[PDB]
């Protein structure tokens, strides 16, 4: 009565199978096995206990040749919210006015182009500000350095809190640059640069010892094609600095409708689980709506990480369809932005840092 | 100086500054251009609105460039959206919790619903009669039912359709009808889902709307044998060229880890990312409970069968994987351990998914 059936089984489950079976084909992630129908339910019970996946009945699709051919992806069974008190206390320390002041200063450069002296001055000033902040709060485990940009004279600025911690890092970024000409660059990406500077200040003023280093990075030459972030990613590979997760803040201040506080999670060139985690952090800690959008190839600095398979996510001020119409112009000015919106992005950065760096 | 840029085809087609093609493939060109022209390309890219470019100069020339190429996201494509509030909210108001509980009472009274048993067969026959009686009761005339065979397994899959003549990629809502052998009431798995989608089918059958797409309600056979029925159904649709736009799977809609916490879970493994995000929005907008995310592994449930053929498929579920019902696959998987409000919420989700997607 009992028939032969063929099952595609993940290796993690296949290794524990003890009913009689023949292996028909195999690869790194799967075996295809032949077993009796009367023993299949035994494999269900086993799968339940092992908790690394179940199996797919492939009898219909078939033998060793077919089976091998059939084989030419098994998911591991994390990002959670486990630090409410610490996050909520840190969110209470964010000072909106600090964001506004940083943005005032950044937007007063004629531009912040990676080919210009003003571009260079921007990088120097961000570096100093972070350094002064580390001294102000007595934070002793910090370090700063430039990562060069080839023929572009503006370097990327890399900063770290927990310089000696040997674990995959958590990275928070923005880009410091603009196009040439008169470019205040308030929204893109003065706003993100300023939002993450205030989040850095909050981490710097805490006395927590995290389980992972935390980087704050301001990339050079994003406008030129992600130049600075490509140099940073390469710098990390060449110094074997592992990275667990990256968030990008690029445009944190323009609201399509002042009364709608929705934050947008970008779904192209980003890590799916990390993106979902941002959606949760927004809902749990920021208490505003979340919606989804795509911004295209080469959209911002997260893409540089995503290309090297490092988990990276991108929350943004608007959808792509409704983006700030003044970006890349002399009209990209701070009065058109919303400080609450900028503050909310800063809160997100802080919550991402504290949750992920504490595990 | 010159610079090399990796450009999507859509943008590359519009470039009129001087440039040399160094390499190209189906989705991209790498071009060489003067540095003085790069900002021109930024402006162009902003206007063309199909993506920007990556500066690859650091990584390079034609050999490196071709080697570098060995894709491009679409930005003006249709998006899953919420555009049918009034119709959805009225249909949600028609869902009757009690009908769900009654269906579940009947399904759980079979000794089991194993695909190798007569009780498995009787389950499929009863579901088919129930859908058919419901279609006649409301005078819905554009419906049709059929069994899809399951090879050696005697339980067929039940495929049902509302809008049988409509020539457009369909919307599919599923659950599995089966259990293990022995005494398996299978309340949670997957009596609950089977019942939640039966009540959603009733609501669509009782409406008078003419949708722009056929709507399928499917109860798969032999899910517990490794997705056997779903595979037969997917193959049936491929061999008959019945196109499918989007699929949702309801597997376990009734157990709450904490009775007071009504969170619904979107499964991120073996599912379509955009459709999964859309479910999160449907949950938040129409159901008004929290959403959280979890993975359940290879061969989890019938959505995987669709996902393998690149048909967009999504899987909302009653708990996380870690916090899943502890009575599953046992005789204790009983109705009394379930929560009817949770089952009703899943039924609402099915109704909202059908009406939103089938109306576009
Ligand atoms: Zn930007
Ligand atoms: Zn920009
Ligand atoms: Zn199930
Ligand atoms: Zn099951």
Residue numbers in the entry:
A (entry chain A): 3 to 64, 72 to 81, 89 to 93, 97 to 378
B (entry chain B): 5 to 64, 72 to 81, 89 to 378
Give sentences copied directly from the paper behind this entry.
LapA is a protease-activated, broad-spectrum aminopeptidase. LapA is annotated as a leucine aminopeptidase, and the Merops database assigns LapA as a member of the M28 family of peptidases (subfamily E). Given the enzymatic activity of LapA, which was revealed by structural analysis, we posited that LapA promotes L. pneumophila growth in A. castellanii by cleaving aminopeptides to release amino acids for uptake by the parasite. Thus, we infer that ProA cleaves and activates LapA.
To confirm the activities of LapA, we purified recombinant LapA-His6-tagged protein containing 378 amino acids of the mature lapA product (minus the 23-residue signal sequence). The structure of LapA contains two molecules in the asymmetrical unit, and all residues could be built except for the N-terminal His tags and residues within the interdomain linkers (residues 82 to 101) that connect the PA domain (residues 1 to 81) and aminopeptidase domains (residues 102 to 378). The PA domain is formed of four helices and three β-strands, and the aminopeptidase domain has nine helices and seven β-strands. Although LapA was purified as a monomer, in our structure, the PA domain of one chain was associated with the aminopeptidase domain of an adjacent chain, which formed a domain-swapped dimer. The domain-swapped monomers were essentially identical, with a root mean square deviation (RMSD) over Cα atoms of 0.083 Å (without linkers), although variations were seen within the interdomain sequence. In our structure of LapA, the PA domain covers the active site and substrate-binding pocket and thus represents the proenzyme form of LapA. The structure of LapA is similar to those of several known aminopeptidases. For example, the positions of active-site residues in LapA and LapB structures are almost identical, while there is a significant reorganization of helices between PA domains. This accommodates differences in their substrate-binding pockets, with LapB’s cavity being wider and more negatively charged, compatible with a preference for positively charged lysine and arginine. The effect of the PA domain is likely due to a transient association between the PA and peptidase domains in LapA, as we observed a monomeric and domain-swapped form in solution.
